[PDB]
Amino acid sequence: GPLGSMTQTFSSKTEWRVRAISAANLHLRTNHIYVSSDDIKETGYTYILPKNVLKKFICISDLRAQIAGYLYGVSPPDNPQVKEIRCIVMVPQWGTHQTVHLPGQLPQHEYLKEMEPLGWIHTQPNESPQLSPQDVTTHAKIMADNPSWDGEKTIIITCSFTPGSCTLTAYKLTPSGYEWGRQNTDKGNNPKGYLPSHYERVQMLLSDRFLGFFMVPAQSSWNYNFMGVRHDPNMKYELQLANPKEFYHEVHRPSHFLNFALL
Amino acid sequence: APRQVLDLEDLVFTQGSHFMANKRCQLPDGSFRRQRKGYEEVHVPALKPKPFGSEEQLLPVEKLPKYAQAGFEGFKTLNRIQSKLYRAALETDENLLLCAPTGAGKTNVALMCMLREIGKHINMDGTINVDDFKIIYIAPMRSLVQEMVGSFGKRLATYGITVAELTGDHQLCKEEISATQIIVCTPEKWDIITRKGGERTYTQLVRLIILDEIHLLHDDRGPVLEALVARAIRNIEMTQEDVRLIGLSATLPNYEDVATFLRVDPAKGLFYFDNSFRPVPLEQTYVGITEKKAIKRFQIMNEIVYEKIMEHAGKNQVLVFVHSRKETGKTARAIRDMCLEKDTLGLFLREGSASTEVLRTEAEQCKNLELKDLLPYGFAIHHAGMTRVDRTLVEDLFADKHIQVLVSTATLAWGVNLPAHTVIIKGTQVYSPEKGRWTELGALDILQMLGRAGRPQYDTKGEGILITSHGELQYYLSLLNQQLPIESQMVSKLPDMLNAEIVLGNVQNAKDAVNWLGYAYLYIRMLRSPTLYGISHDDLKGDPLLDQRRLDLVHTAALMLDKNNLVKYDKKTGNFQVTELGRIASHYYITNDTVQTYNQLLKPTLSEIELFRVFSLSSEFKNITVREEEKLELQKLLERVPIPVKESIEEPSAKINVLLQAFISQLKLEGFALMADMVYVTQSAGRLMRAIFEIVLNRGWAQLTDKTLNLCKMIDKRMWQSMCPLRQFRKLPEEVVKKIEKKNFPFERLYDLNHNEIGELIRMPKMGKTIHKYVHLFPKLELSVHLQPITRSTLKVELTITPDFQWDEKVHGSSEAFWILVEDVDSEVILHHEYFLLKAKYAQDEHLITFFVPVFEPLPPQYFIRVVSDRWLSCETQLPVSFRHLILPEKYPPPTELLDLQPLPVSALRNSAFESLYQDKFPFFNPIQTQVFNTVYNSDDNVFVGAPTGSGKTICAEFAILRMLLQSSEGRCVYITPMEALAEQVYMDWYEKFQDRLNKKVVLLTGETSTDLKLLGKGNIIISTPEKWDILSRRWKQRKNVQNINLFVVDEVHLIGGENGPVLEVICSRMRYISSQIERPIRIVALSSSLSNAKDVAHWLGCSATSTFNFHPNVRPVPLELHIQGFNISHTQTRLLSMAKPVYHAITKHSPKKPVIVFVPSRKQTRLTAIDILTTCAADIQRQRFLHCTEKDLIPYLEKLSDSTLKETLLNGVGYLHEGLSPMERRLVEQLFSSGAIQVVVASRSLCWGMNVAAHLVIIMDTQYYNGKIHAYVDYPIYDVLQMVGHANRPLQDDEGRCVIMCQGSKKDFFKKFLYEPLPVESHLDHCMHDHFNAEIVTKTIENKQDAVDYLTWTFLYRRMTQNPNYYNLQGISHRHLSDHLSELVEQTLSDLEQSKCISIEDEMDVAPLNLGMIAAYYYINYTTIELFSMSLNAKTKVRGLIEIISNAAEYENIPIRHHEDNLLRQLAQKVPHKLNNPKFNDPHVKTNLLLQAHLSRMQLSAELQSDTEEILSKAIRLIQACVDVLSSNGWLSPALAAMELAQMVTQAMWSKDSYLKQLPHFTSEHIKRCTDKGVESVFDIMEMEDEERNALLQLTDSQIADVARFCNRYPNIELSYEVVDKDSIRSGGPVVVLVQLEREEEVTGPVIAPLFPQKREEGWWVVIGDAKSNSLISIKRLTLQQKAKVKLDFVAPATGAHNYTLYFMSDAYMGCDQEYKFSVDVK
Ligand SMILES: Nc1cc(S(N)(=O)=O)ccc1O
Ligand SMILES: Nc1cc(S(N)(=O)=O)ccc1O
Ligand SMILES: Nc1cc(S(N)(=O)=O)ccc1O
Ligand SMILES: Nc1cc(S(N)(=O)=O)ccc1O
C-alpha cells in the first residue's frame, strides 16, 4: 500500500528498436530457404525465382510488417511452360502483419517493357496452410484494374518466416477466386464468401543458374512504414535500376534522426 | 636462448609522470614548514643567481656570424644562457641537450640552432635554398605549437623562411609541407607521419629535429619521443645522412641519461643550468591539505585561495589556474563573493581610476555572461570555450594591468605569453577520461604554469603558490627543485611501438628488435638503474649488456602482437611477418587490442547497430565506466538515440555508443564526467572509423564500406545524412535550412528550379538566389561509360567523369576527393575501387578513368559505378552499367597443334655456308622452328608465327632471309622490331651472322634520313624500329628502294595492342598496300607472342591459314613453371616489405643453385633487394651460396666500379642493374652473371627489354611502378610482364624455366587469365590518326574523304571493328554501321587537320596539303607541335624564345623521375643566360627547357639524367629545322637565321659566345684567353699557325693535337660564288635566278665531328637571300654538300627600286662557318 513512499518511474521502451535489432539478423535465414513442394501433377506453369534477389528481399524486410515486390519475367527460349523471374520491383508501400498497402499505379519503366508481369511476392510473419483472403482480394483488385495481369499467369509467392528460416509457397487465383476477391470489402481474417477453391498451388523453384535484379523508386525509397501519412493509394512514382535499402535504413525513418537532434 | 615470457603490466610505472623514483627530498636552504588547521605550508625562498663568475659576458649580436645577425634583429645582446651556448649552437653541429629552469631561454638557443641550419643553405645571391632542407620542431602541446609558428615565423620572415603547423587533413597538407621549411608539430603527429612509409616523403630533407620539453619522457606520452629518436638515429645509420638533435629539458635528475639517449657528447654538447638561472626568482609556497572529506576540503581550499589573494589584493595581479572550463567561472565567482561579504572588493579596484570604467564598458559590450558578472570587479576568466575576441579581450586587459585576478585553464599557460606576479595552482587533481578517473596534473603542465610567475621585466620576484593534498607535497617539491628523476615509460607502449617498426621494415626479426630497443631511453635507464625496471643486480652482472632481458621483452611483445594477428612471429627463427592489420594499426595510430577486436567482429553483414557497438568496444575506451550519477541522463539518451543499442546501460560500451550518437546529433549533456568522456570518445572516433573504412573497403564489402564511409562523414560534419546537405555550408543560416528540412521535398528537387521557383517552394522568396548559388556549389558529377570487352570474361571500362557544379575555392579549397566503387549485381562486392581527386585547375574538364572488371556467362543484369565524396555527406552519383546490349567477342579458336615432327637437323638447309651459322651452337632446331621451316624456307607465302617469348621465333625470320638470299643476290629484307634495345641486340647478332660470315650487308637505321636512305640502298638486311621506317616508307612513291623490298619481317607484332602500336600497325598496312600496287609482292613474316585473335592479324597481313602458326603458351620449348603469389596489402612499400623474404624463399625453393633474375619496380629497389637477399642469406642454412667463383677472380671487376655497395653485394654473389649505372658497369655485372660467377641479379623494370642475360628462375617483385607525372602507381603493361617471364629460359642449360610473380591480390586473377591463355590484342589507331592522315595527304595517297575510308580498310583496326564492335564504339557489324563509323572518324580527323591549317578542304570533299602539314610530315613532327609553333613564333622571336617554343613541343612528355631535381633546377635556372616567366616542376617540358641550357653551357653531369639529355637531343634538330621552315615560309629573316644558328648551338654545345674556339677538342677557357691574347679567335686562325707556335700557344699532348687536327680537317672550308643571271635585264614581277656554286676544297669523307651530340650527323647548309632592317626573307634552299655542288634560287622582283640584298650561307652543324656576301640588283 504505497503512494509516493515506494515510488517508481516509467522509462519508455519503444517497439521499433527491438524490431530493428532482430531485423539485423535476417541474413541468417537466407542460408535456410525452403520451398514447399506440396503441389502435384506438374500441371500448370513453373516459376523459377533467382536466389540472389530472394535473399536481398528477405534481408530488406521486417519480421512483423509485411513487405511486397512485383514480379517480372519471361519464358526461356523454347520452354513456354517455365516462367523465369528476372526482376523484383519495390514500390512505395507500407504494411501490417496481415497485408500490404501498395499504390494503384503498377510499375512503369522502359527496362520492364520486354518482360511480362508475373504477380507479386510478400513476406509473412508465420506459415499458413491456406492462402490469405487479404491476398486473394489484393490480387483480384489489381487484376480488375490492370488487364495485363492474366489470371492464369500471375502468382503470389508467400515468404513465411519460420524461426530459423523462410518457407516459400506459390499460389495463383482461380476464376472463382478472382470474382470473389474483386467484390470483397471485408478486410477481417474471415470475410463472407471466402473459399479454398479460390486459389491453387503452382510449382516454384529456386535457382542459382541466373541472377535477377531490382528496380526501386526514382525520387524516394520504397519503405513508407514510418511515413504512412505521406503514403496515398493515388501516389505516382517513377523507377530506377538499383538495389533497395533495408527496412530500418536511415532514409526510411528520417524523423528519428531529426527529432533526436531537436532533443 | 631459453627465453622467458614477461608480464609487461607488472613492469609498468602506473603513475605515469607522477611516478617518483627518488626516495628522499632535500629543500633549498632557508625553506620552512608551518602548520595550520587542516593543512601544512612549505615555503621555499627565491634562489640567488650565480654572480657572473667565469667572466662570461653577454655576446653582443654584433659578434655573431653575419648571416645569423638578422635573426637577432632588435636585440643588443643574447641573454646569459644563449651566450654560454652560442659556440655549440652556431659554430658546431654537435647534438645538444640543454637543461634549464622553465623560462631561461632554451627556445632561443633552439632558434640559434635553426639559424646554423639555415646558414648551411645561403648562396652568393643572398637568398636561401629553401627547398634543400626541413627543420622539425617538436613541442608537447598543440597550443604551444601555434604560438611557436607565430614567434618563429616572425623572427625568420627576413630570410624567406616559412614556418607552419601540420593540419589534420592529409592531401592539401603535403602540398603545404613542400613549401614549409620549419614544421612545428607534436610528438604524436611526427610519429604518425614518419610511420607511413612512402619514399616520395619529404622527411628525407629533415636536417634538424628540436625536442622541446623533453622531460615529457617521464609522461605516459614519453614513449613517442623514444620511438621518434630511435627511428631517427637508426635511420641516420641507414642512410649516413646526418640529422642534428637538440633536446630542451627542465632541470631534473637523469639528464645525463637523456643525453646518452640523444647521442650527445657530455663533454661537448651537454649544458646544465640550475634553478637559480630562472630569469625572475621564485618564492614558492606549497599548501598541502590534510582534510579527507569532500565538503570540508573544498571549503578549506576556497579559504586558502582567498587568504592568498588578500596578501596580493591591490599590490599584485594573481593568475589562478583551475582544472575545468566551468571551474574558472565557479572559482572566480567564489572568490569575489567572499570578497563582497567581507567588504574587500575595494582593494582590487581604486574608485578613482579609469581602470574601473574600462572594465564596466568592456563588460557591458562583452558577449560572455560570466565575463559580464565578473569584469566590473576586476575578476576575469579565460579558457578554450570562449570567443577569440573575448580571449584577446582578457589578454589585452590583463597585460594592461586592468584585471587583478585572472582565473584560467592550462591552455592559457601553454598558448599565450601572459605572466603574472603571482600564480596560484588551485588543486592538482584533474579528470582523465583515458584513465577513467581523477589523476594528478602532469608534470609538464605544473612546470609551465608555475613558469608563468614573475613578469620578466616588471617584477623583481615572482610568487608561485601550489595547493594540493598533503600526501603529494614531496612529489611537487621534487618536481620544482631539480629532484624528480626522468624515467622511461616505454614498457607501457612496447607492443604498439614495436609493431610500427615492423610495419616500416626497420625491424624484421627479434634480433633487429633487440638492437632497436638499444636506442630506447628505456635501455639506458635499465642499464643505469636496473632494479627500478625489475632487474636484480645479480641479473645485470650476469647479462651486462641486457641482451637476454631485451630479447625477453621483445619476445613478450612479439607474442602479444601475434596473438592479435598484427604480426606472424616464428618463435624458432625469431622472424616477424607484417600484415595488413598490423599496418592499419600503425598507420591509424590504433592500439593492437583494438584491431584484434575489429578483426574479430567485423563482417560484411554488419548493420549500423553492430557498427556502433564495434566502435564502442575499442581499447582506447577500456577504462571508461558508467557512474551511477550519470545513469539517469544516459537512460534519457539511450531510449531516444536513432541507432538502437542492444546492451544494457550497465555496460561501458553502451555509454560510449550513446556518447558518439549524441555528439553527431550535437546534443548538450549535463554531467561533467559525461561531457569530458564524450570529448575523449569523439576526438578519436574519426581515425578509428577511418581505419574500419579502410579494412572493409580493401576487403571489398560494399554495404559496410558505404555505412562506414558514411559514419566517418557524420562524425566529421556532426550531422546525419537525414539532414539537408545544405547545412554543410556553414555560411547558410540555420533558420532557412530548417525551413527547407521542414518542407520535406527531395534535395535534388532543387536542381530543376530557377532562383525564383526555389524561393517559392520554400515558402519564403527573399532567399531564392542565395539558395540557387549554394545548390549549384554542392559537389556533383555526371558519369558515362564506354564498355570495351576484352574476352567473354574480362571487360575494360572507360568512365567519363564530367563535373556538374560551380567551383568556388572558398568552399571547395583547391581539390575535392571521391571514391570510385564498381559494385556487382547485388551491391555486395566491390569489384574495383580507386581514389579520384578533382583539382581546381581541372574543375571544368572531363576526366577519363579506365579499369578492368570480371564478367561471366550468363551475363549478369548490371553492375554499378558509385562515385562518392570522401568528405561531403549526401554527395554521390551512381550509374547503372547494364549488359543488355553488350556484344562479347567470339571465344577464341584452338591453337595450332604442335605436331611432334622429328627434330630438324641444320642439315635441312642444304647449304654449307648457311649451316655454318648454327652448326657450332646446336645440332637440331626446336619443335616450333621444325614445324614452320617448310613454310618459311621452302615457300613464299606470307607467314605468321605466334608463340611465347623464348620460343626462338628469330630463327624463323632467319629462315625467311636465307631463302631471300638464294632467290635474289641483292635481296632487300627490312626487319622491324618495336624496341631500340631489341634492335641493337638483333643488329649485333645479325651483323655477325650475315655480314661477318655470309658477306652480306647488315645495317641499323639511325633515324637520320640521308644516312638511312644509303643504308637502305646498300643493305641486304635492314634493321629498324617502327618510327624510323615510318619516316622512310611514307615517301614510297619517290623511293624505289622502299618498293624494291623482297621481304618485310615484323617482330613482336602483338605490341600493336600497346602504347606505340599505331605506328607499327600503319607501317605494316602500308607494306601490304605497296605490295598490291607494284604487282610483284613483298613477302611478309609476322612474329608474335601467343595471340588468341591471331587469325585476324594473319588475315590483315595476308597470311593463309596453312601459313599461320598460332601456338599456345604451353608449347614453349623449354617448359615454363609459372607461379602467381598474391599479397593482400594495398600499401605499396609495406607490400614490398612483405615480399622481401618470399623472394629469398623462392630462390631456395625453385632455384637453389641456378641463375636467378629478380625484377623490381624502381632503381632504388634494386640495391635494397640485393642487400636484403644478402641479409637473408647470412642468417640461413647456406651463406655465400650465391658466389661460385673465388674472391680472387672478382677483383679486377671490382676495381672499375664506382658504386661501392654494388661491390659489397657482388662479392656475396648478388649483382644489380638499373638506369643509373654506367654502361660498362652494367656490362661487368652482365658478364659476371653470364659466366656463372654470381647467381642472382636484381634488375629494374625499365631494363626488361635491354637485358642480354637469361635465367633459370625469374621473380617479379610487384607489378606496379610509381609515375611521378601523375603521382600515382601504374600497372606494368602486360607486354612487359611477358617479356620478363621470357627471361626464364635457358634452352641449352635447363630442363625447364621457373617464374614467380608476386603481386597485389587484386591483380592475381588478371594475370592468370592473360599469362596462361594467349593474348587478345586490339588496335588503338583510331586514337592516333591525325599525323598519319597528314602524311598521306602530303603524299597524295589520300586526296578526298572517300580515300581516307578506303585507306582505313587496309588496317588492323578495320578488321577488329567487325570482330569486337563494342571495343571501338560500334553497336553492330553491318556494312552501314562500319561505313558510318569510318566516315565519322575520317570527318573528325580531317576537321582537326583543317582547323590546324595543315590541310585544306574544298567542296567539303577534296583535301589538299598545306604548308604546315607539309612541314609536319617532312620532319615527322606532331601536327599539334607545328600548330603551336605557328601560334607561338613571331617575326622577331628571341633565340631564347625559340628555346622555349621548341621545349613545349608534344614530343617531350617523358621525364618525371625526380621533382626535387627540378627544385634544384630552381637554382640552376638562375645561371642559365635565357630568361622566362616561371619555374613549375612536375612538367616534362620544363625538364626539357632546362636540360637543354645544361647542354649548351656544358653544365655538370648525371647518370639517368644524361640518358634523358640524349633523347632530347635526338629531336632538337628536327624541331629547329621546322621552325626555320615556318619562319622562311612566312617570310621573316631575322629569327630564321637565329634558329639556323641554334642548330649550330645544339650540335656543338655552345651559346652565342663569339669565340668559336670552344668547338676544338681539348680546349679550355684559358686556351681561348691565350689564343685571343695572341690574336686567334677563329678555327682557321689556329690552322693557319706554324705548327710549333700553335704547340707553344696551347699546352698539348700528342693525341690531343691529333684530335684538334682531325677536327680542323673535317671543318668546312667552303669557297662560294654567286652569279645573278640576267644581271641587267630583269623587270619587276619577274624572274631573278641566282646560281650559287660551292667548293669544299681540302677533302670530305667523314661525318660531322661533334662529341657533345649523340647521333651521327652530316653537314647541312641553307642558302638564304634576304634583306636586313626589312626582315624580308626572299629565297632559301637547303642542301647537302660533297666537295662540289651548284644550286639555283628563285625570286620575283618586288619593284624597280634597284637596291641591295644580303646573302647568307648558314651551317646547321658548325659555328663560325657562316658566310655573308652582299650583292645589289638593279631592276633591268
Ligand atoms: N522450420 C525451422 C527450421 C530450422 S533450421 N533449417 O535452421 O534447422 C530451425 C527451426 C525451425 O522452426
Ligand atoms: N626519411 C625518414 C626520416 C626520419 S626523421 N626522424 O629524420 O624525420 C625517420 C625515418 C625516415 O624513414
Ligand atoms: N624479338 C625477339 C623474340 C625472341 S623469341 N625467343 O620469342 O622468339 C627472342 C629475341 C628477340 O629479340
Ligand atoms: N582482402 C584484402 C585484399 C587487399 S588487396 N589485394 O586489394 O591489396 C587488401 C586488404 C585485404 O584485407
Numbering used by the authors:
A (entry chain J): 2058 to 2320
B (entry chain B): 404 to 2127
The authors write:
BRR2 is responsible for the unwinding of U4/U6 di-small nuclear (sn) RNAs, an essential step for the conversion of a pre-catalytic spliceosome (B complex) to an activated spliceo­some. The ∼250 kDa enzyme is composed of an N-terminal auto-regulatory region of about 400 residues and tandem helicase cassettes, each comprising two RecA-like domains (RecA1 and RecA2), a winged-helix (WH) domain, a helical bundle (HB) or ratchet domain, a helix–loop–helix (HLH) domain and an immunoglobulin-like (IG) domain. Due to its essential role in each splicing event and its association with the genetically inherited visual deficiency retinitis pigmentosa, BRR2 is an interesting target for the development of small-molecule modulators.
Five compounds (24, 50, 76, 78 and 86) bound only to a single pocket, two fragments (26 and 34) bound at two pockets and two substances (18 and 39) bound at three pockets simultaneously. Compounds 24 and 50 again exhibited different binding poses. Compound 18 exhibited a third binding site, pocket 4, corresponding to the C-terminal ATP-binding site of hBRR2T1. Pockets 4, 5 and 6 were each only bound by one fragment. The position of compound 18 in pocket 4 directly overlaps with the observed position of ATP in the C-terminal ATP-binding site. Indeed, the sulfonyl group of compound 18 established interactions with key residues of ATP-binding motifs. A hydrogen bond is formed to Lys1356 of motif I (which usually contacts the β- and γ-phosphate of ATP), as well as van der Waals interactions with Gly1353, Gly1355 (part of the flexible phosphate-binding loop) and Asp1454 and Glu1455 of motif II (responsible for the coordination of magnesium and, in active helicase modules, for the activation of a water molecule for hydrolysis). Perhaps surprisingly, we did not detect binding of compound 18 to the N-terminal ATP-binding pocket. The C-terminal helicase cassette is inactive in ATP hydrolysis, the motifs deviate from those of the N-terminal cassette and the pocket of the N-terminal cassette is probably more flexible to undergo frequent ATP hydrolysis cycles; this probably contributes to the lack of binding of compound 18 at the N-terminal site.
